[PDB]
Amino acid sequence: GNPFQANVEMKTFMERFNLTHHHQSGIYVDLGQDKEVDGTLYREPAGLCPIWGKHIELQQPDRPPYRNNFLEDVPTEKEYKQSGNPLPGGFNLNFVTPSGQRISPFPMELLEKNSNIKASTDLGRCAEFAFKTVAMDKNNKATKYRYPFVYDSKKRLCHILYVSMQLMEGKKYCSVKGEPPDLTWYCFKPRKSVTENHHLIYGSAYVGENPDAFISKCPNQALRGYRFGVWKKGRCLDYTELTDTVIERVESKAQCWVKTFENDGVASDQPGQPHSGGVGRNYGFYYVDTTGEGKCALSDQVPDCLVSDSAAVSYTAAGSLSEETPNFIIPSNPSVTPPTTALQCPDSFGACDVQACKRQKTSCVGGQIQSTSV
Ligand SMILES: *[C@@H]1O[C@H](CO)[C@@H](O)[C@H](O)[C@H]1NC(C)=O
Ligand SMILES: [Cl-]
Ligand SMILES: [Cl-]
Ligand SMILES: [Co+2]
Ligand SMILES: [Co+2]
Ligand SMILES: [Co+2]
């Protein structure tokens, strides 16, 4: 009776929101796997979806030589000796080829021209590049450890991050703006900003295993005009009707989008199972309460239906603030189904929910599926 599971076109579309199914790992901190280097088992990011706007914010001293930018090269021994504690620089792999050719960041133009790179989108080409890049051990032998990446979609640069850590905190473990001075590491944590670094896309290398998969399987963009919901008692209940939903006031829809990533319940693999598998309070929407206040509803329930609401926007921890598809995830061949028709289009009513005294109404309006309770 659920229209969003009724026809396959609808089902397929709704699948992209199931981060347990496709992404399958932590989002805030992604450490879903473990791989051996130099006889040592290291935690490895593993998630299959790109995480839009995610960046790692550093807490280095606010002064030279420190840049507080995780895309800077990992420091050389000499740079570290020059700075003293904490480590300066960032997370970027600083290695060069036997030629002396820099490995990261790597320009998308060269990946586009590399016949061995099969992905059909620039974001996919970066992920594939990361998937085909493995850590070399102390004996310069290949391992199965793959570094995570950041795609800089503005500069069209693919960063391979030698530092795969995503969160460190506590004065026992790391320093904030140089205090305690005895510690090697500065503190850092993942972040999404209402205004900054929307052009940065974080991912595990395993986004690149089947590079074109994220296009259909991942909730890359915000969804305008609908509230996420769950099919219960023959109708679609948006999150505000569920008991375990967190509802909070926000000043803007972008604050809500940030909350779906930064709230304490988001899928995360950090100590800090320790393997979330993608389970978590990853889902939310902005809406306007009857009193006119902007609010944000957050849930760990994977949506399986939608409720129409022209003033709402549904977000996930994985996706972007924008509802608009950017050109760097539109495939350059016609075989791969593009990311964007699923919700276009008889007035259908459903059995009365006596418990709430409302009924489903599934219709078509403005060439677009309506779904509400009456
Ligand atoms: C989401 O995916 C998981 C894993 O495949 C599955 O167990 C669950 O039933 C799915 N839920 C929805 C709402 O599709
Ligand atoms: Cl001290
Ligand atoms: Cl001391
Ligand atoms: Co699936
Ligand atoms: Co593990
Ligand atoms: Co923006």
Side-chain angles (χ1 to χ4, degrees), residues 1-18 229-231 302-306:
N2 184 1
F4 299 91
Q5 302 307 120
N7 65 78
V8 191
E9 199 134 308
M10 221 82 88
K11 251 184 171 144
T12 298
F13 168 80
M14 290 302 295
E15 267 266 298
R16 74 191 46 185
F17 296 113
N18 192 342
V230 301
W231 192 254
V302 174
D304 66 11
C305 60
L306 303 173

mmCIF file with all atom_site columns, all heavy atoms in Angstrom, residues 1-18 229-231 302-306:
data_model
loop_
_atom_site.group_PDB
_atom_site.id
_atom_site.type_symbol
_atom_site.label_atom_id
_atom_site.label_alt_id
_atom_site.label_comp_id
_atom_site.label_asym_id
_atom_site.label_entity_id
_atom_site.label_seq_id
_atom_site.pdbx_PDB_ins_code
_atom_site.Cartn_x
_atom_site.Cartn_y
_atom_site.Cartn_z
_atom_site.occupancy
_atom_site.B_iso_or_equiv
_atom_site.pdbx_formal_charge
_atom_site.auth_seq_id
_atom_site.auth_comp_id
_atom_site.auth_asym_id
_atom_site.auth_atom_id
_atom_site.pdbx_PDB_model_num
ATOM 1   N N   . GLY A 1 1   ? 0.812  -1.210 0.000   1.00 0.00 ? 1   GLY A N   1
ATOM 2   C CA  . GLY A 1 1   ? 0.000  0.000  0.000   1.00 0.00 ? 1   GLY A CA  1
ATOM 3   C C   . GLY A 1 1   ? 0.846  1.261  0.000   1.00 0.00 ? 1   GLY A C   1
ATOM 4   O O   . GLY A 1 1   ? 0.360  2.358  -0.309  1.00 0.00 ? 1   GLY A O   1
ATOM 5   N N   . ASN A 1 2   ? 2.115  1.101  0.366   1.00 0.00 ? 2   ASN A N   1
ATOM 6   C CA  . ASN A 1 2   ? 3.082  2.194  0.319   1.00 0.00 ? 2   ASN A CA  1
ATOM 7   C C   . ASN A 1 2   ? 3.436  2.522  -1.125  1.00 0.00 ? 2   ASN A C   1
ATOM 8   O O   . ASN A 1 2   ? 4.071  1.710  -1.805  1.00 0.00 ? 2   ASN A O   1
ATOM 9   C CB  . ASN A 1 2   ? 4.347  1.816  1.085   1.00 0.00 ? 2   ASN A CB  1
ATOM 10  C CG  . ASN A 1 2   ? 5.364  2.955  1.146   1.00 0.00 ? 2   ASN A CG  1
ATOM 11  O OD1 . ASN A 1 2   ? 5.135  4.062  0.637   1.00 0.00 ? 2   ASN A OD1 1
ATOM 12  N ND2 . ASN A 1 2   ? 6.479  2.692  1.806   1.00 0.00 ? 2   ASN A ND2 1
ATOM 13  N N   . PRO A 1 3   ? 3.038  3.712  -1.600  1.00 0.00 ? 3   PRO A N   1
ATOM 14  C CA  . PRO A 1 3   ? 3.340  4.028  -3.002  1.00 0.00 ? 3   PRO A CA  1
ATOM 15  C C   . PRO A 1 3   ? 4.843  4.069  -3.306  1.00 0.00 ? 3   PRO A C   1
ATOM 16  O O   . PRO A 1 3   ? 5.249  3.757  -4.428  1.00 0.00 ? 3   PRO A O   1
ATOM 17  C CB  . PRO A 1 3   ? 2.703  5.409  -3.198  1.00 0.00 ? 3   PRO A CB  1
ATOM 18  C CG  . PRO A 1 3   ? 2.545  5.971  -1.826  1.00 0.00 ? 3   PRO A CG  1
ATOM 19  C CD  . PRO A 1 3   ? 2.326  4.805  -0.920  1.00 0.00 ? 3   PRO A CD  1
ATOM 20  N N   . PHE A 1 4   ? 5.646  4.432  -2.309  1.00 0.00 ? 4   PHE A N   1
ATOM 21  C CA  . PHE A 1 4   ? 7.094  4.561  -2.487  1.00 0.00 ? 4   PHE A CA  1
ATOM 22  C C   . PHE A 1 4   ? 7.820  3.235  -2.511  1.00 0.00 ? 4   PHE A C   1
ATOM 23  O O   . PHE A 1 4   ? 9.024  3.189  -2.758  1.00 0.00 ? 4   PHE A O   1
ATOM 24  C CB  . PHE A 1 4   ? 7.670  5.464  -1.408  1.00 0.00 ? 4   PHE A CB  1
ATOM 25  C CG  . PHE A 1 4   ? 7.114  6.850  -1.448  1.00 0.00 ? 4   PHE A CG  1
ATOM 26  C CD1 . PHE A 1 4   ? 5.998  7.181  -0.716  1.00 0.00 ? 4   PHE A CD1 1
ATOM 27  C CD2 . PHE A 1 4   ? 7.692  7.813  -2.248  1.00 0.00 ? 4   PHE A CD2 1
ATOM 28  C CE1 . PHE A 1 4   ? 5.483  8.456  -0.757  1.00 0.00 ? 4   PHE A CE1 1
ATOM 29  C CE2 . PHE A 1 4   ? 7.186  9.078  -2.300  1.00 0.00 ? 4   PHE A CE2 1
ATOM 30  C CZ  . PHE A 1 4   ? 6.073  9.406  -1.549  1.00 0.00 ? 4   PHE A CZ  1
ATOM 31  N N   . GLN A 1 5   ? 7.085  2.160  -2.261  1.00 0.00 ? 5   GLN A N   1
ATOM 32  C CA  . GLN A 1 5   ? 7.607  0.809  -2.445  1.00 0.00 ? 5   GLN A CA  1
ATOM 33  C C   . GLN A 1 5   ? 6.818  0.090  -3.544  1.00 0.00 ? 5   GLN A C   1
ATOM 34  O O   . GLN A 1 5   ? 7.179  -1.008 -3.972  1.00 0.00 ? 5   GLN A O   1
ATOM 35  C CB  . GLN A 1 5   ? 7.547  0.023  -1.138  1.00 0.00 ? 5   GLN A CB  1
ATOM 36  C CG  . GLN A 1 5   ? 8.322  0.676  -0.004  1.00 0.00 ? 5   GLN A CG  1
ATOM 37  C CD  . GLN A 1 5   ? 9.782  0.986  -0.373  1.00 0.00 ? 5   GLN A CD  1
ATOM 38  O OE1 . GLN A 1 5   ? 10.218 2.152  -0.339  1.00 0.00 ? 5   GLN A OE1 1
ATOM 39  N NE2 . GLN A 1 5   ? 10.542 -0.058 -0.716  1.00 0.00 ? 5   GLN A NE2 1
ATOM 40  N N   . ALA A 1 6   ? 5.756  0.745  -4.009  1.00 0.00 ? 6   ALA A N   1
ATOM 41  C CA  . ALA A 1 6   ? 4.852  0.166  -4.989  1.00 0.00 ? 6   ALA A CA  1
ATOM 42  C C   . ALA A 1 6   ? 5.562  -0.150 -6.299  1.00 0.00 ? 6   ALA A C   1
ATOM 43  O O   . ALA A 1 6   ? 5.710  -1.316 -6.667  1.00 0.00 ? 6   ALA A O   1
ATOM 44  C CB  . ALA A 1 6   ? 3.679  1.116  -5.240  1.00 0.00 ? 6   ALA A CB  1
ATOM 45  N N   . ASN A 1 7   ? 5.984  0.893  -7.008  1.00 0.00 ? 7   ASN A N   1
ATOM 46  C CA  . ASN A 1 7   ? 6.663  0.710  -8.278  1.00 0.00 ? 7   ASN A CA  1
ATOM 47  C C   . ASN A 1 7   ? 8.158  0.879  -8.155  1.00 0.00 ? 7   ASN A C   1
ATOM 48  O O   . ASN A 1 7   ? 8.657  1.636  -7.315  1.00 0.00 ? 7   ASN A O   1
ATOM 49  C CB  . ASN A 1 7   ? 6.136  1.680  -9.313  1.00 0.00 ? 7   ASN A CB  1
ATOM 50  C CG  . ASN A 1 7   ? 6.431  3.088  -8.958  1.00 0.00 ? 7   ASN A CG  1
ATOM 51  O OD1 . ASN A 1 7   ? 7.544  3.565  -9.137  1.00 0.00 ? 7   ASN A OD1 1
ATOM 52  N ND2 . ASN A 1 7   ? 5.435  3.775  -8.442  1.00 0.00 ? 7   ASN A ND2 1
ATOM 53  N N   . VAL A 1 8   ? 8.854  0.176  -9.037  1.00 0.00 ? 8   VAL A N   1
ATOM 54  C CA  . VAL A 1 8   ? 10.275 -0.028 -8.910  1.00 0.00 ? 8   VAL A CA  1
ATOM 55  C C   . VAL A 1 8   ? 10.957 1.324  -9.085  1.00 0.00 ? 8   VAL A C   1
ATOM 56  O O   . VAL A 1 8   ? 11.963 1.591  -8.452  1.00 0.00 ? 8   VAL A O   1
ATOM 57  C CB  . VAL A 1 8   ? 10.786 -1.069 -9.937  1.00 0.00 ? 8   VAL A CB  1
ATOM 58  C CG1 . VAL A 1 8   ? 12.224 -1.490 -9.619  1.00 0.00 ? 8   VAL A CG1 1
ATOM 59  C CG2 . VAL A 1 8   ? 9.889  -2.309 -9.935  1.00 0.00 ? 8   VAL A CG2 1
ATOM 60  N N   . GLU A 1 9   ? 10.380 2.196  -9.902  1.00 0.00 ? 9   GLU A N   1
ATOM 61  C CA  . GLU A 1 9   ? 10.976 3.512  -10.121 1.00 0.00 ? 9   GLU A CA  1
ATOM 62  C C   . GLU A 1 9   ? 11.041 4.273  -8.792  1.00 0.00 ? 9   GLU A C   1
ATOM 63  O O   . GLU A 1 9   ? 12.055 4.894  -8.441  1.00 0.00 ? 9   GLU A O   1
ATOM 64  C CB  . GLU A 1 9   ? 10.180 4.305  -11.164 1.00 0.00 ? 9   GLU A CB  1
ATOM 65  C CG  . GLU A 1 9   ? 10.935 5.468  -11.804 1.00 0.00 ? 9   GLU A CG  1
ATOM 66  C CD  . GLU A 1 9   ? 10.775 5.522  -13.337 1.00 0.00 ? 9   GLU A CD  1
ATOM 67  O OE1 . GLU A 1 9   ? 11.010 4.487  -14.002 1.00 0.00 ? 9   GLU A OE1 1
ATOM 68  O OE2 . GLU A 1 9   ? 10.424 6.598  -13.882 1.00 0.00 ? 9   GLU A OE2 1
ATOM 69  N N   . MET A 1 10  ? 9.950  4.196  -8.045  1.00 0.00 ? 10  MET A N   1
ATOM 70  C CA  . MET A 1 10  ? 9.888  4.794  -6.731  1.00 0.00 ? 10  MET A CA  1
ATOM 71  C C   . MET A 1 10  ? 10.838 4.107  -5.745  1.00 0.00 ? 10  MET A C   1
ATOM 72  O O   . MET A 1 10  ? 11.556 4.792  -5.030  1.00 0.00 ? 10  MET A O   1
ATOM 73  C CB  . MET A 1 10  ? 8.459  4.737  -6.209  1.00 0.00 ? 10  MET A CB  1
ATOM 74  C CG  . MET A 1 10  ? 8.056  5.980  -5.503  1.00 0.00 ? 10  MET A CG  1
ATOM 75  S SD  . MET A 1 10  ? 7.546  7.258  -6.609  1.00 0.00 ? 10  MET A SD  1
ATOM 76  C CE  . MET A 1 10  ? 5.833  6.785  -6.721  1.00 0.00 ? 10  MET A CE  1
ATOM 77  N N   . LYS A 1 11  ? 10.817 2.772  -5.702  1.00 0.00 ? 11  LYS A N   1
ATOM 78  C CA  . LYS A 1 11  ? 11.698 1.974  -4.848  1.00 0.00 ? 11  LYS A CA  1
ATOM 79  C C   . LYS A 1 11  ? 13.165 2.299  -5.064  1.00 0.00 ? 11  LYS A C   1
ATOM 80  O O   . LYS A 1 11  ? 13.928 2.502  -4.119  1.00 0.00 ? 11  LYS A O   1
ATOM 81  C CB  . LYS A 1 11  ? 11.523 0.484  -5.132  1.00 0.00 ? 11  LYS A CB  1
ATOM 82  C CG  . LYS A 1 11  ? 10.845 -0.321 -4.067  1.00 0.00 ? 11  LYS A CG  1
ATOM 83  C CD  . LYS A 1 11  ? 10.823 -1.811 -4.447  1.00 0.00 ? 11  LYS A CD  1
ATOM 84  C CE  . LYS A 1 11  ? 10.340 -2.679 -3.289  1.00 0.00 ? 11  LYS A CE  1
ATOM 85  N NZ  . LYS A 1 11  ? 9.509  -3.835 -3.748  1.00 0.00 ? 11  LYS A NZ  1
ATOM 86  N N   . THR A 1 12  ? 13.554 2.291  -6.332  1.00 0.00 ? 12  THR A N   1
ATOM 87  C CA  . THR A 1 12  ? 14.932 2.552  -6.713  1.00 0.00 ? 12  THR A CA  1
ATOM 88  C C   . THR A 1 12  ? 15.356 3.922  -6.202  1.00 0.00 ? 12  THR A C   1
ATOM 89  O O   . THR A 1 12  ? 16.448 4.079  -5.676  1.00 0.00 ? 12  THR A O   1
ATOM 90  C CB  . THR A 1 12  ? 15.107 2.489  -8.234  1.00 0.00 ? 12  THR A CB  1
ATOM 91  O OG1 . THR A 1 12  ? 14.792 1.165  -8.696  1.00 0.00 ? 12  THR A OG1 1
ATOM 92  C CG2 . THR A 1 12  ? 16.528 2.819  -8.610  1.00 0.00 ? 12  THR A CG2 1
ATOM 93  N N   . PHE A 1 13  ? 14.475 4.907  -6.347  1.00 0.00 ? 13  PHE A N   1
ATOM 94  C CA  . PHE A 1 13  ? 14.788 6.260  -5.920  1.00 0.00 ? 13  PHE A CA  1
ATOM 95  C C   . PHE A 1 13  ? 14.982 6.299  -4.411  1.00 0.00 ? 13  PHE A C   1
ATOM 96  O O   . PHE A 1 13  ? 15.970 6.862  -3.923  1.00 0.00 ? 13  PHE A O   1
ATOM 97  C CB  . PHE A 1 13  ? 13.689 7.231  -6.347  1.00 0.00 ? 13  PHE A CB  1
ATOM 98  C CG  . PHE A 1 13  ? 13.786 8.596  -5.708  1.00 0.00 ? 13  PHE A CG  1
ATOM 99  C CD1 . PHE A 1 13  ? 14.670 9.552  -6.187  1.00 0.00 ? 13  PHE A CD1 1
ATOM 100 C CD2 . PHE A 1 13  ? 12.982 8.915  -4.628  1.00 0.00 ? 13  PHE A CD2 1
ATOM 101 C CE1 . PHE A 1 13  ? 14.754 10.803 -5.588  1.00 0.00 ? 13  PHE A CE1 1
ATOM 102 C CE2 . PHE A 1 13  ? 13.046 10.162 -4.027  1.00 0.00 ? 13  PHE A CE2 1
ATOM 103 C CZ  . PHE A 1 13  ? 13.932 11.108 -4.499  1.00 0.00 ? 13  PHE A CZ  1
ATOM 104 N N   . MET A 1 14  ? 14.064 5.678  -3.675  1.00 0.00 ? 14  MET A N   1
ATOM 105 C CA  . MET A 1 14  ? 14.128 5.689  -2.216  1.00 0.00 ? 14  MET A CA  1
ATOM 106 C C   . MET A 1 14  ? 15.313 4.923  -1.650  1.00 0.00 ? 14  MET A C   1
ATOM 107 O O   . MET A 1 14  ? 15.749 5.213  -0.527  1.00 0.00 ? 14  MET A O   1
ATOM 108 C CB  . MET A 1 14  ? 12.853 5.120  -1.614  1.00 0.00 ? 14  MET A CB  1
ATOM 109 C CG  . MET A 1 14  ? 11.632 5.998  -1.794  1.00 0.00 ? 14  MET A CG  1
ATOM 110 S SD  . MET A 1 14  ? 11.776 7.657  -1.113  1.00 0.00 ? 14  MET A SD  1
ATOM 111 C CE  . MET A 1 14  ? 11.913 7.256  0.627   1.00 0.00 ? 14  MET A CE  1
ATOM 112 N N   . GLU A 1 15  ? 15.810 3.935  -2.395  1.00 0.00 ? 15  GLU A N   1
ATOM 113 C CA  . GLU A 1 15  ? 17.005 3.180  -1.998  1.00 0.00 ? 15  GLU A CA  1
ATOM 114 C C   . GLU A 1 15  ? 18.216 4.086  -1.693  1.00 0.00 ? 15  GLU A C   1
ATOM 115 O O   . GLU A 1 15  ? 19.004 3.809  -0.792  1.00 0.00 ? 15  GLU A O   1
ATOM 116 C CB  . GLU A 1 15  ? 17.396 2.189  -3.106  1.00 0.00 ? 15  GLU A CB  1
ATOM 117 C CG  . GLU A 1 15  ? 16.820 0.793  -2.946  1.00 0.00 ? 15  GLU A CG  1
ATOM 118 C CD  . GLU A 1 15  ? 17.765 -0.178 -2.236  1.00 0.00 ? 15  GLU A CD  1
ATOM 119 O OE1 . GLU A 1 15  ? 18.865 -0.448 -2.752  1.00 0.00 ? 15  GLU A OE1 1
ATOM 120 O OE2 . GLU A 1 15  ? 17.400 -0.701 -1.165  1.00 0.00 ? 15  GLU A OE2 1
ATOM 121 N N   . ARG A 1 16  ? 18.340 5.193  -2.409  1.00 0.00 ? 16  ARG A N   1
ATOM 122 C CA  . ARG A 1 16  ? 19.515 6.033  -2.257  1.00 0.00 ? 16  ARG A CA  1
ATOM 123 C C   . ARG A 1 16  ? 19.636 6.610  -0.853  1.00 0.00 ? 16  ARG A C   1
ATOM 124 O O   . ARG A 1 16  ? 20.703 7.124  -0.482  1.00 0.00 ? 16  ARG A O   1
ATOM 125 C CB  . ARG A 1 16  ? 19.510 7.156  -3.292  1.00 0.00 ? 16  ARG A CB  1
ATOM 126 C CG  . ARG A 1 16  ? 18.538 8.245  -3.039  1.00 0.00 ? 16  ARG A CG  1
ATOM 127 C CD  . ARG A 1 16  ? 18.412 9.182  -4.233  1.00 0.00 ? 16  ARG A CD  1
ATOM 128 N NE  . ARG A 1 16  ? 18.284 8.448  -5.487  1.00 0.00 ? 16  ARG A NE  1
ATOM 129 C CZ  . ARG A 1 16  ? 18.248 9.007  -6.693  1.00 0.00 ? 16  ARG A CZ  1
ATOM 130 N NH1 . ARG A 1 16  ? 18.320 10.336 -6.830  1.00 0.00 ? 16  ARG A NH1 1
ATOM 131 N NH2 . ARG A 1 16  ? 18.128 8.216  -7.755  1.00 0.00 ? 16  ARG A NH2 1
ATOM 132 N N   . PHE A 1 17  ? 18.558 6.537  -0.076  1.00 0.00 ? 17  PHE A N   1
ATOM 133 C CA  . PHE A 1 17  ? 18.572 7.118  1.255   1.00 0.00 ? 17  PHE A CA  1
ATOM 134 C C   . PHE A 1 17  ? 18.950 6.123  2.327   1.00 0.00 ? 17  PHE A C   1
ATOM 135 O O   . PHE A 1 17  ? 19.053 6.485  3.498   1.00 0.00 ? 17  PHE A O   1
ATOM 136 C CB  . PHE A 1 17  ? 17.222 7.727  1.570   1.00 0.00 ? 17  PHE A CB  1
ATOM 137 C CG  . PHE A 1 17  ? 16.872 8.872  0.670   1.00 0.00 ? 17  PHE A CG  1
ATOM 138 C CD1 . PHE A 1 17  ? 15.826 8.771  -0.245  1.00 0.00 ? 17  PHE A CD1 1
ATOM 139 C CD2 . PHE A 1 17  ? 17.618 10.025 0.695   1.00 0.00 ? 17  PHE A CD2 1
ATOM 140 C CE1 . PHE A 1 17  ? 15.524 9.819  -1.085  1.00 0.00 ? 17  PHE A CE1 1
ATOM 141 C CE2 . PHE A 1 17  ? 17.323 11.082 -0.142  1.00 0.00 ? 17  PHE A CE2 1
ATOM 142 C CZ  . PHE A 1 17  ? 16.262 10.976 -1.036  1.00 0.00 ? 17  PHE A CZ  1
ATOM 143 N N   . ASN A 1 18  ? 19.136 4.870  1.955   1.00 0.00 ? 18  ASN A N   1
ATOM 144 C CA  . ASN A 1 18  ? 19.481 3.830  2.915   1.00 0.00 ? 18  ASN A CA  1
ATOM 145 C C   . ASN A 1 18  ? 20.970 3.706  3.104   1.00 0.00 ? 18  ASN A C   1
ATOM 146 O O   . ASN A 1 18  ? 21.598 2.950  2.468   1.00 0.00 ? 18  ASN A O   1
ATOM 147 C CB  . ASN A 1 18  ? 18.855 2.477  2.562   1.00 0.00 ? 18  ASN A CB  1
ATOM 148 C CG  . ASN A 1 18  ? 18.966 1.470  3.695   1.00 0.00 ? 18  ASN A CG  1
ATOM 149 O OD1 . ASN A 1 18  ? 19.757 1.643  4.594   1.00 0.00 ? 18  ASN A OD1 1
ATOM 150 N ND2 . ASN A 1 18  ? 18.147 0.431  3.660   1.00 0.00 ? 18  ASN A ND2 1
ATOM 151 N N   . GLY A 1 229 ? 9.980  10.074 5.886   1.00 0.00 ? 229 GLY A N   1
ATOM 152 C CA  . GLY A 1 229 ? 9.018  9.393  6.726   1.00 0.00 ? 229 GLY A CA  1
ATOM 153 C C   . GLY A 1 229 ? 9.137  7.889  6.679   1.00 0.00 ? 229 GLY A C   1
ATOM 154 O O   . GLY A 1 229 ? 9.922  7.327  5.909   1.00 0.00 ? 229 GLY A O   1
ATOM 155 N N   . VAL A 1 230 ? 8.332  7.233  7.517   1.00 0.00 ? 230 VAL A N   1
ATOM 156 C CA  . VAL A 1 230 ? 8.286  5.777  7.587   1.00 0.00 ? 230 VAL A CA  1
ATOM 157 C C   . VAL A 1 230 ? 6.845  5.275  7.429   1.00 0.00 ? 230 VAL A C   1
ATOM 158 O O   . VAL A 1 230 ? 5.912  5.837  8.002   1.00 0.00 ? 230 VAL A O   1
ATOM 159 C CB  . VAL A 1 230 ? 8.849  5.253  8.919   1.00 0.00 ? 230 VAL A CB  1
ATOM 160 C CG1 . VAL A 1 230 ? 10.303 5.701  9.084   1.00 0.00 ? 230 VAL A CG1 1
ATOM 161 C CG2 . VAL A 1 230 ? 8.015  5.765  10.068  1.00 0.00 ? 230 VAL A CG2 1
ATOM 162 N N   . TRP A 1 231 ? 6.685  4.207  6.664   1.00 0.00 ? 231 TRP A N   1
ATOM 163 C CA  . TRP A 1 231 ? 5.356  3.669  6.391   1.00 0.00 ? 231 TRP A CA  1
ATOM 164 C C   . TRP A 1 231 ? 4.870  2.866  7.593   1.00 0.00 ? 231 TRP A C   1
ATOM 165 O O   . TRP A 1 231 ? 5.448  1.831  7.934   1.00 0.00 ? 231 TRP A O   1
ATOM 166 C CB  . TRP A 1 231 ? 5.378  2.795  5.137   1.00 0.00 ? 231 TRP A CB  1
ATOM 167 C CG  . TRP A 1 231 ? 3.993  2.437  4.637   1.00 0.00 ? 231 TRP A CG  1
ATOM 168 C CD1 . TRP A 1 231 ? 3.368  1.217  4.731   1.00 0.00 ? 231 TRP A CD1 1
ATOM 169 C CD2 . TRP A 1 231 ? 3.067  3.310  3.979   1.00 0.00 ? 231 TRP A CD2 1
ATOM 170 N NE1 . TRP A 1 231 ? 2.116  1.285  4.172   1.00 0.00 ? 231 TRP A NE1 1
ATOM 171 C CE2 . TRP A 1 231 ? 1.905  2.557  3.704   1.00 0.00 ? 231 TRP A CE2 1
ATOM 172 C CE3 . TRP A 1 231 ? 3.106  4.656  3.592   1.00 0.00 ? 231 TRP A CE3 1
ATOM 173 C CZ2 . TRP A 1 231 ? 0.801  3.104  3.057   1.00 0.00 ? 231 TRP A CZ2 1
ATOM 174 C CZ3 . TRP A 1 231 ? 2.005  5.200  2.951   1.00 0.00 ? 231 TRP A CZ3 1
ATOM 175 C CH2 . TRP A 1 231 ? 0.869  4.425  2.691   1.00 0.00 ? 231 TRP A CH2 1
ATOM 176 N N   . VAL A 1 302 ? 15.701 4.820  8.686   1.00 0.00 ? 302 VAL A N   1
ATOM 177 C CA  . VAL A 1 302 ? 15.871 4.909  7.242   1.00 0.00 ? 302 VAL A CA  1
ATOM 178 C C   . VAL A 1 302 ? 14.510 5.224  6.620   1.00 0.00 ? 302 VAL A C   1
ATOM 179 O O   . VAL A 1 302 ? 13.528 4.527  6.882   1.00 0.00 ? 302 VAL A O   1
ATOM 180 C CB  . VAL A 1 302 ? 16.445 3.614  6.666   1.00 0.00 ? 302 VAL A CB  1
ATOM 181 C CG1 . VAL A 1 302 ? 16.474 3.660  5.140   1.00 0.00 ? 302 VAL A CG1 1
ATOM 182 C CG2 . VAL A 1 302 ? 17.847 3.376  7.204   1.00 0.00 ? 302 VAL A CG2 1
ATOM 183 N N   . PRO A 1 303 ? 14.428 6.293  5.816   1.00 0.00 ? 303 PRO A N   1
ATOM 184 C CA  . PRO A 1 303 ? 13.106 6.573  5.246   1.00 0.00 ? 303 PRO A CA  1
ATOM 185 C C   . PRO A 1 303 ? 12.656 5.532  4.200   1.00 0.00 ? 303 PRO A C   1
ATOM 186 O O   . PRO A 1 303 ? 13.452 4.978  3.419   1.00 0.00 ? 303 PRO A O   1
ATOM 187 C CB  . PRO A 1 303 ? 13.287 7.961  4.611   1.00 0.00 ? 303 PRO A CB  1
ATOM 188 C CG  . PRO A 1 303 ? 14.709 8.121  4.400   1.00 0.00 ? 303 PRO A CG  1
ATOM 189 C CD  . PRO A 1 303 ? 15.423 7.316  5.450   1.00 0.00 ? 303 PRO A CD  1
ATOM 190 N N   . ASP A 1 304 ? 11.357 5.246  4.202   1.00 0.00 ? 304 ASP A N   1
ATOM 191 C CA  . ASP A 1 304 ? 10.804 4.360  3.181   1.00 0.00 ? 304 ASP A CA  1
ATOM 192 C C   . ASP A 1 304 ? 9.563  4.981  2.557   1.00 0.00 ? 304 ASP A C   1
ATOM 193 O O   . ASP A 1 304 ? 8.892  4.353  1.745   1.00 0.00 ? 304 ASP A O   1
ATOM 194 C CB  . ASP A 1 304 ? 10.523 2.949  3.754   1.00 0.00 ? 304 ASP A CB  1
ATOM 195 C CG  . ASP A 1 304 ? 9.432  2.921  4.805   1.00 0.00 ? 304 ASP A CG  1
ATOM 196 O OD1 . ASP A 1 304 ? 8.707  3.921  5.002   1.00 0.00 ? 304 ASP A OD1 1
ATOM 197 O OD2 . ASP A 1 304 ? 9.306  1.858  5.444   1.00 0.00 ? 304 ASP A OD2 1
ATOM 198 N N   . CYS A 1 305 ? 9.282  6.230  2.918   1.00 0.00 ? 305 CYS A N   1
ATOM 199 C CA  . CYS A 1 305 ? 8.290  7.024  2.219   1.00 0.00 ? 305 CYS A CA  1
ATOM 200 C C   . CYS A 1 305 ? 8.590  8.508  2.448   1.00 0.00 ? 305 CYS A C   1
ATOM 201 O O   . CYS A 1 305 ? 9.518  8.874  3.185   1.00 0.00 ? 305 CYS A O   1
ATOM 202 C CB  . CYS A 1 305 ? 6.867  6.670  2.677   1.00 0.00 ? 305 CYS A CB  1
ATOM 203 S SG  . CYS A 1 305 ? 6.514  6.926  4.451   1.00 0.00 ? 305 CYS A SG  1
ATOM 204 N N   . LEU A 1 306 ? 7.802  9.350  1.796   1.00 0.00 ? 306 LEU A N   1
ATOM 205 C CA  . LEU A 1 306 ? 7.949  10.790 1.863   1.00 0.00 ? 306 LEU A CA  1
ATOM 206 C C   . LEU A 1 306 ? 6.615  11.435 2.086   1.00 0.00 ? 306 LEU A C   1
ATOM 207 O O   . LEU A 1 306 ? 5.584  10.935 1.633   1.00 0.00 ? 306 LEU A O   1
ATOM 208 C CB  . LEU A 1 306 ? 8.542  11.355 0.569   1.00 0.00 ? 306 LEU A CB  1
ATOM 209 C CG  . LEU A 1 306 ? 9.886  10.825 0.091   1.00 0.00 ? 306 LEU A CG  1
ATOM 210 C CD1 . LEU A 1 306 ? 10.221 11.373 -1.298  1.00 0.00 ? 306 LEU A CD1 1
ATOM 211 C CD2 . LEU A 1 306 ? 10.940 11.205 1.119   1.00 0.00 ? 306 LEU A CD2 1
#
